[PDB]
Amino acid sequence: GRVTHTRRTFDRALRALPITQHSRIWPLYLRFLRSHPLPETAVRGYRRFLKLSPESAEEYIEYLKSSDRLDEAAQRLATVVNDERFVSKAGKSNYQLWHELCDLISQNPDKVQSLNVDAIIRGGLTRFTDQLGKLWCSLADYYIRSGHFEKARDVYEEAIRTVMTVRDFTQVFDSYAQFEESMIAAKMETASELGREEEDDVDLELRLARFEQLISRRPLLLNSVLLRQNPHHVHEWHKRVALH
Amino acid sequence: NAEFVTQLACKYWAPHIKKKSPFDIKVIEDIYEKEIVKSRFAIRKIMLLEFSQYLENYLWMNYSPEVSSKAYLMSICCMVNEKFRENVPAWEIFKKKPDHFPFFFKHILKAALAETDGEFSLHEQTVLLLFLDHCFNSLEVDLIRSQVQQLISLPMWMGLQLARLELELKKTPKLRKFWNLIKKNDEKMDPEAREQAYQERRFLSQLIQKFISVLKSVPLSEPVTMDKVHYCERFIELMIDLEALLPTRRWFNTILDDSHLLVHCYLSNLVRREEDGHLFSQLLDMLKFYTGFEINDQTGNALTENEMTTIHYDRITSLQRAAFAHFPELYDFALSNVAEVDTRESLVKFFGPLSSNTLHQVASYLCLLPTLPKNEDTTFDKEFLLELLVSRHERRISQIQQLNQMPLYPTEKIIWDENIVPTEYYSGEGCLALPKLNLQFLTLHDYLLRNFNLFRLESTYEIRQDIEDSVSRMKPWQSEYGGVVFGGWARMAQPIVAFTVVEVAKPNIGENWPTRVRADVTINLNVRDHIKDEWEGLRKHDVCFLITVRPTKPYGTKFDRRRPFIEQVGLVYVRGCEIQGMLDDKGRVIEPRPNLRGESRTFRVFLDPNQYQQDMTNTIQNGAEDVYETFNIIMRRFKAVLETIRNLMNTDCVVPDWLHDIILGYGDPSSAHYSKMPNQIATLDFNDTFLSIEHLKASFPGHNVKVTVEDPALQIPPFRITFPVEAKTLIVEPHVIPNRGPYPYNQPKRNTIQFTHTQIEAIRAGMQPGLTMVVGPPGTGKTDVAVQIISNIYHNFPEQRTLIVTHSNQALNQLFEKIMALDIDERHLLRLGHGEEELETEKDFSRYGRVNYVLARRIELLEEVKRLQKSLGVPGDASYTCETAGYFFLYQVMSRWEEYISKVKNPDVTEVSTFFPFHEYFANAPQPIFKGRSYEEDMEIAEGCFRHIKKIFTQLEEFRASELLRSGLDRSKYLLVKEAKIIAMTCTHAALKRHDLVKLGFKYDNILMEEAAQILEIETFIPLLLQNPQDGFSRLKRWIMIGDHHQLPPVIKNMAFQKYSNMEQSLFTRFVRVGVPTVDLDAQGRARASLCNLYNWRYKNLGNLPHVQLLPEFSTANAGLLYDFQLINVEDFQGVGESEPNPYFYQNLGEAEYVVALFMYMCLLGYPADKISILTTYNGQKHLIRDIINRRCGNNPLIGRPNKVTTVDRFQGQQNDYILLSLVRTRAVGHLRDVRRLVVAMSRARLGLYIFARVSLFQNCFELTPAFSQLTARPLHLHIIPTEPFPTTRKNGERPSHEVQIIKNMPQMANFVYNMYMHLIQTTHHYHQ
Structure with missing residues (x-):
């Protein structure tokens, strides 16, 4: 109950520096962390700026990420996301992928301002690339938590420029059907821009039916887009469809 | 009629006359009609009348409604105009006698709205336009605001069309309650009062209508008078001022929108006349830009893009609804969306x-507009209607994109433009499309656009006047195939045989401009030998210009002085350059010079950070020519700045919310005091200030000292001093600074300066969060107070960074030198620069010096760790680096201290010695530290030794960075990042590397500034953007600047900048003008009271310390001069008073030779040649003094050289025991009107000043009356004691015991000097050679 016994214990145990007494000192600071974040914070700073090992900041982060202080946990993770001489601070073990999993845990439906989740997805994609999966999820969340007016059209245009695989046009289709009325001139020309989308056998129907069944009136444009969407090679019934 | 005006003045109004003739309305009418009216408002007659002080002595003191006449009104208006032109306080007469100010300003506005070309001509009407603009821009004056009060108030909306005002009240419902309130309060008004109020409210509308009609009365191609054009221009100028001032625009811009003055302007033939209406169209363009500025009319804050876009698209939606309801042809138009x-x-x-x-x-x-009735014809053209509709409903580009699309270089359509970048001969009669930087800005982007326009206009004034320097001697000729040709020989100019851009070095991260752009200029010196020596004496950093001209006068065209030099010589562009040295046959810049063979010389120069950045931007974005290749000349005697402005404009400029409105000048300016900071630290340690409890009692004249300890021999520590929040009680809590070991050499360094209560109040305002301005008079210790405040801040705040900004080398070197005597370790002080910087301190604060000191202290710390290991008796022969030293500290020293603590803190004074186990670590120390008499003191000394070892380990933990950064630049960056808690640099270096350190890891927590009166509005607005914001808030917690509002400001390259834009109004002086508290030191110690009175009259209770009052050196007589400060008249000699060899090269051999006889008399009396300073009113006068002195004395073995013979302002920041002032001016007073330069040239003497001046010319200077009162208290001759050598035991007051000579003129003075020197030549001899 008094810090004198624990401090003197850890001090006389640090007489040498073999593997022993780490499993005392680290959990000693961990138990001190209750009722005061100061011992855990300063001991974590001293450890991660102290004696040489890969697992020092690992145990510090395992103790600090379960806590109610995430700045200290991601701060150990930042001293790790430098590593200052060693890309593979762990190798096939990943602690930056761990930071990205923490970023997903913070992108969980807690801070829904549509700012921090997308910024954390950009930070996790910037640490290590996330190709079309977390990228498709980040573009989906950015286009879905956004509005309907030209802001959603710009979101879907940039996300199309960055798009990798199919169903990104489906995400832009969702944005368009939700944006059925973004202005009083073309009424979300995104319906046409996405119905005439990529040329052969990909969706051919997604954005068309989106504009068609926003609720329903009559699209009168989805037909022209879809039958103008690359019928078979040049000489065929293609003129008949494009004329009908 | 110069003699007529002078006789009339001396008879009726001129000062320095016993009896004056009384005022007569006939006198005023005759003067006006016969001088201004007959000679068409003469500038020289205006100047002579100003020197006669008609407004201060004649006009207003006898003016009244019964004396109100057109001549008197126009005369007072022209007097205020000339006051603005010459930068003199104008409305002091109105502040003295505000009684007839209502009738005066009312009749002036009546004259402005009166019939044009009727009683008052267009000349007087434009005069009244500019005068009214002045009365609006001087709205910080109570009485002028009193006339603008109802005239520019919200009741000014009484002149708008009924539908527009109704729609305004509907869009803002709370305006309807205020309109009802105004209509109700108007019921209690008289008919005359009601008509006066409505006339005041409609004055602006009637004036705008009159101006638009004057414009419409100008034909397109048929020639018309220039006066009507200039009247419409000055009208647009007043419009621009009242449109850029927020509380002045709030309501008037609504009437301006209702009238659409921009529409009639852009429809008139005046805006189509390229040569007639160039500057007027430029002004109208500024007005349209400001009318389309994104600033909320209701609160004054800038709007969001969503806000302005909503406004435009809502106007579009209402226009579409109106189309559907009232225009059948526009059914499609009603169906068309915003994007359509x-x-x-x-x-x-x-x-x-x-x-x-x-x-x-x-x-x-x-x-x-008025409603269009049934079947009528609208008298406004379809052109007018469609233009108004399209300008009102058409998309506008944001100011952000507009500003970012501007190339940062001056082009060929600007280099020769006087309407925005005028010359140095500009009299001030016309207007310039110039920014206004005085008091308040609509937004930070607004103030930044003004400051950026000003900096770019200064650079264009440097690319206009020096642009015509392709050899400027004999008007360079055009030659075969239009090429250049040199027609003569040029001394200060030469044609360059080539110029090659040598280095394009990469920028620092973040900034948008390279770090270094150099060019080598090759010229073949086939000219005189001494001229070639002057040329080849090239050195480092010397300011040079590369000049480009595309001359149009064919070979042999005559030269005419009064013509525009720019077009005369065909100038293209001139960019500055900084020569680093001459290149020789080894390709090396000159750093014992190698012997030049041939006459070809190539000099390597580099102008700026962004030297070759702005022209690159121009040629890349908008197709401008490559200006670094069409230059023709090299001649000796702003792109990075605009890029820093762009950084401010393109970043969110996240400024402290307590500094936003402060820099904007609006609101309550007293919210910046440590008295208005809600974050004040109640219990603070000013420790290094208070030297005693008596001193702590003396620094609080009106405070009750409540000291928590009564024992007097136990209260003079670094005593903690808490300030209250009964209501005057300051708590003195004694302490003891904890020991740092056994060596008495580690005793913390303490100040020796007994700072007065005012200086202590300034240091305390600096050590309490917020902003402060400390007024430092000559010799009150501004640098000392800065070092003391920084000391206290470092004392109470260990992790905080101190950002010490300065203007010049002497200021920062004084900061470091005074810091050298404080208890500050050499690991926390850091210095930046612009490159090369002479170390003017004792110890090296530089980058390389810092890495070297790091290496030295790291050697020391690792050696202390090794010797501590030996003291511990450890096995092992290896040496330890800082990582191993940290490991060993935590392993043994911390462990040993833990053992000692568990032994002695859980209890004998014998145990104090038994259980300190580093005895072999203290074997090299005083006799055993633990004395064992007292357990507490023994524990204190032992803990101090263990903490000394801990500080060794902490210096090693710091020096980890020096081992982790192999490069010197890298380790120095690491020190500036973590090790540096003191970052001190120049404003130029801040504006240069601002973004660089910002992306590199710069921090700012507490900032101090020196020479705040020497850095510009933009140069002092720069430091606010030194870092990035932290979590939605800036990191800046405090800024304490020390300056002097009465001293020299930054110099404008071409004086047209302060002529038109008044950019000379610095941030410090502008804060003073706002009225912000200034902590005014007044305790001098460098000038005895008699000499100090020459500058202490201008300040707030300016005094001297007991040191200056009682110094034995202070009242010591000046050898051979019974006068300590003399102003001796210099009459005509050889027929010459003020003389002029070259245009504007003023010199006076008369006062020069009087100063020569005086300085040679000092040399012949033995007065120390170091203590003889020669200053002048002209650099030409300094050069004449130097030439005549070196021609007469030269190597006269009895005579040294006067330490300084140079420019008055170029001697700022310095002082002398004797300053010899040459006031050559006797025809015009010149720039001596500036009270700043006045106090500057008057505070150049610590104990002795000898001036040769024109007594009547000086007394005629109204600004120089408090100075001439102390000047003419002495005889107008040289009153000396010639037989009195260097040592004179006489006091300043004690009677002379020698022969007194009263020399009446320079010829007798020089003859007597030569005769005394001749007797010295027959009796004595010197031997220095």
Whole structure:
């Protein structure tokens, strides 16, 4: 109950520096962390700026990420996301992928301002690339938590420029059907821009039916887009469809 | 009629006359009609009348409604105009006698609205336009605001069309309650008072209508008078001022929108006349830019893009609704969305083929004009209707994109433009499309655009006047195939045989401009030998110009002085350059020079950080020519700045919310005091200030000292001093600074300065969060107070960074030198620069010096760790680096201290010695530290030794960075990042590397500034953007600047900048003008009271310390001069008073030779040649003094050289025991009107000043009356004691015991000097050679 016994214990145990007494000192600071974040914070700073090992900041982060202080946990993770001489601070073990999993845990439906989740997805994609999966999820969340007016059209245009695989046009289709009325001139020309989308056998129907069944009136444009969407090679019934 | 005006003045109004003739309305009318009216408002007659002080002595003191006449009104208006032109306080007469100010300003506004070309001509009407603009821009004056009060107030909306005002009250419902309140309060008004109030409210509308009609009365191609054009121009100038001032625009801009003055302007033939209306169209362009500025009318804050876009698209939506309801031809137009019609193109494609009366109906339904009745003809053209509609509903580009699309270089359409970048001969009669930087800005972007326009206009004034320097001697000629040709020989100019851009070095991260751009200029010196020596004496950093001209006068065209030099010589562009050295046959810049063979010399120069950045931007973005290749000349005697402005404009400029409105000048300016900071630290340690409890009692004249300890021998520590929040009680809590070991050499360094209570109040305002300005008079210790405040801040705040900004080398070197005597370790002080910087301190604060000190202290710390290991008796022969030293500290020293603590803190004074186990670590120390008499003191000394070892380990933990950064630049960056808690640099270096350190890891927590009166509005607005914000808030917690509002400001390259824009109004002086508290030191110790009175009259209770009052050196007589400060008249000699060898090269051999006889008399009396300073009113006068002195004394073995013979302002920041002032001016007073330069040249003497001046010329200077009162208290001759050598035991007051000579003139003075020197030549001899 008094810090004198624990401090003197850890001090006389640090007489040498073999593997022993780490499993005392680290959990000693961990138990001190209750009722005061100061011992855990300063001991974590001293450890991660102290004696040489890969697992020092690992145990510090395992103790600090379960806590109610995430700045200290991601701060150990930042001293790790430098590593200052060693890309593979762990190798096939990943602690930056761990930071990205923490970023997903913070992108969980807690801070829904549509700012921090997308910024954390950009930070996790910037640490290590996330190709079309977390990228498709980040573009989906950015286009879905956004509005309907030209802001959603710009979101879907940039996300199309960055798009990798199919169903990104489906995400832009969702944005368009939700944006059925973004202005009083073309009424979300995104319906046409996405119905005439990529040329052969990909969706051919997604954005068309989106504009068609926003609720329903009559699209009168989805037909022209879809039958103008690359019928078979040049000489065929293609003129008949494009004329009908 | 110069003699007529002078006789009339001396008879009726001129000062320095016993009896004056009384005022007569006939006198005023005759003077005006016969001098201004007959000679068409003469500038020289205006100047002579100003020197006669008609407004201060004649006009207003006898003016009244019964004396109100057109001549008197126009005379007072022209006097205020000339006051603004010459930068003199103008309305002091109105502040003295505000009684007839209502009738005066009312009759002036009546004259401005009166019939044009009637009683008051267009000349007087434009004069009244500019005078009214001045009366609006001087609205910080109570009485002028009193006349603008109801005239520019919200009741100014009484002049708008009924539909527009009704729509305004509908869009802002709370305006309807205020309108009802105004209508109700108007009921209690008299008919005369009601008519006066409505006339005041409609004055602006009637004036705008009159100006628009004056414009419409100008024909397109037929020649018209320039006066009407200039009247419309000055009207647009007043419009621009009242449109850029927020509380002045709030209501007037609504009437300006209702009238659409911009529309009639851009429709008139005046805006189509390229040569007639160039500057007027430029002013109208500024007005349209400001009318389309994104600033909320209701609160004054800048709007969001969503806000302005909503406004435009809502106008579009209401226009579409109005189309559907009232225009059948526009059913499609009502069906067209924002993206369909918001561009001028489609808006005009829909509104242009409409009818004239139809567009009038559109305007009427949109409340633009009077309603168009049935079957009528609208007298406004379809051109007018469609233009107004398209300008109102067409898309506008944001100011952000507009500012970012500007190339940062001056082009060929600007280099020769006087309407925005005028010359140095500009008299001030006309207007310039110039920014206004005085008091308050609509937004930070507004103030930044003004400051950026000003900096770029200064650079264009440097690319205009020096641009015509392709050899400027004999008007360079055009030659075969239009090429250049040198027609003569030029001394200060030469044609360059080539110029090659040698280095394009990469920028620092973040900034948008390279770090170094150099060019080598090759010229073949086939000219005189001494001229070639002057040329080849090239050195480092010497300011050079590369000049480009595309001359148009063919070979042999005559030269004419009064013509515009720019077009005369065909100038193209001139960019500055900084020569690093001459290149020789080894390709090396000159750093014992190698012997030049041939006459070809190539010099390597590099202008700026962004030297070759701005022209690159121009040629890349908008097709400008490569200006670094068409230059013709090299001549000796702003792109990075605009890039820093762009950084400010393109970043969110996240400024402290307590500094936003402060830099904007609006609101309550007292919210910046440590008295208005809610974050004040109640219990603070000013420790290094208070030297005693008596001193702590003396620094609090009106405070009750409540000291928590009564024992007097136990209260003078670094005593903690808490300030209250009964209500005057300051708590003195004694302490003890904890020991740091056994060596008495580690005793913390303490100040020796007994700072007065005012200086202590300034240091305390600095050590309490917020902003402060400390007024430092000559010799009150501004640098000392800065070092003391920084000391206290470092004392109470260990992790905080101190950002010490300065203007010049002497200021920062004084900061470091005074810091050298404080208890500050050499690991926390850091210095930046612009490159090369002479170390003017004792110890090296530089980058390389810092890495070297790091290496030295790291050697020391690792050696202490090794010797501590030996003291511990450890096995092992290896040496330890800082990582191993940290490991060993935590392993043994911390462990040993833990053992000692568990032994002695859980209890004998014998145990104090038994259980300190580093005895072999303390074997090299005083006799055993633990004395064992007292357990507490023994524990203190032992813990101090263990903490000393801990500080060794902490210095090693710091030096980890020096081992982790192999490069010197890298380790120095690491020190500036973590090790540096003191970052001190120049404003130029801040504006240069601002973004660089910002992306590199710069921090700012507490900032101090020196020479705040020497850095510009933009140069002092720069440091606010030194870092990035932290979590939605800036990191800046405090800024304490020390300056002097009465001293020299930064110098404008071409004086047209302060002439028109008044950019000389610095941030410090502008804060003073706001009225912010200034902590005014007044305790001098460098000038005895008699000499100090020459500058202490200008300040707030300026005094001297007991040191200056009682110094034995202070009242010591000046050898051979019974006068300590003398102003001796210099009459005509050889017929010459003020003389002029070259245009504007003023010199006076008369006062020069009087100063020569005086300085040679000092040399012949033995006065120390170091203590003889020669200053002048002209650099030409300094050069004449130097030439005549080196021609007469030269190597006279009895005579040294006067330490300084140079420019008055170029001697600022310095002082002398004797300053010899040459006031050559006797024809015009010149720039001596500036009280700043006055106090500057008057505070150059610590104990002795000898001035040769024109007594009557000086007394005629009204600004120089408090100075001439102390000047003419002495005889107007040289009153000396010639037989008195260097040592004179006599006091300043004690009677002379020698022969007194009263020399009446320079010829007798020089003859007597030569005769005394001749007797010295027959009796004595010197031997230095």
